[PDB]
Design a protein around this ligand. Structure first.
Ligand SMILES: CCCCC[C@H](CC(=O)NO)C(=O)N[C@H](C(=O)N1CCC[C@H]1CO)C(C)C
Ligand code: NI
Ligand SMILES: [Zn+2]
Length: 137
């Protein structure tokens, strides 16, 4: 895979729900490989031109994939999160993020998963889910 150029339309497009049970194992392997090759701690389908709701992470309290991730709970107000993005190398943006989130979805074997995250890991989850909605830093 390749991390798309900063002017790619896919970065602003909405990623489609993955049909329940679809085999995404190779896709997740490829995405994880693209993420680590580019030196990132997360990656979303849009960034590699895959308009499917899949994210991969290697963050302090969560490492792995989430299929069809959704934020089901978050803290009120916002905190400071300085973020760069692999799709826009060179740029760091002071983002407002929820300090804590719960994300739910499925793993590669279609088992339901729940991730309770705070700080950096919460920021990563929000950053990647944003990508799936075509929202970038
Ligand atoms: C921080 C919220 C999630 C950031 C995820 C990005 C990767 C990305 O573009 N995902 O879509 C990353 O690894 N960004 C790094 C990044 O922003 N980091 C890594 C350490 C913490 C934070 C810098 O404040 C670098 C490459 C810019
Ligand atoms: Ni490649
Ligand atoms: Zn990004």
């Amino acid at each position: 895979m390749k991390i798309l150029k900063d002017d790619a339309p896919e970065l602003h497009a909405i990623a489609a729900e993955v049909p329940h049970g679809e085999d995404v194992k190779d896709l997740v392997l490829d995405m994880t490989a693209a993420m680590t090759a580019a030196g990132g701690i997360g990656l979303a389908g849009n960034q590699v031109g895959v308009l499917k709701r899949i994210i991969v992470l290697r963050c302090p309290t969560f490492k792995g994939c989430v299929i069809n991730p959704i934020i089901t709970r978050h803290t009120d107000g916002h905190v400071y999160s300085p973020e760069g993005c692999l799709s826009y190398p060179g740029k760091t943006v002071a983002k407002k993020r929820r300090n804590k989130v719960v994300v739910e979805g499925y793993d590669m074997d279609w088992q339901p998963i729940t991730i309770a995250a705070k700080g950096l890991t919460a920021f990563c989850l929000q950053h990647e889910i944003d990508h799936l909605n075509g929202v970038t830093i």
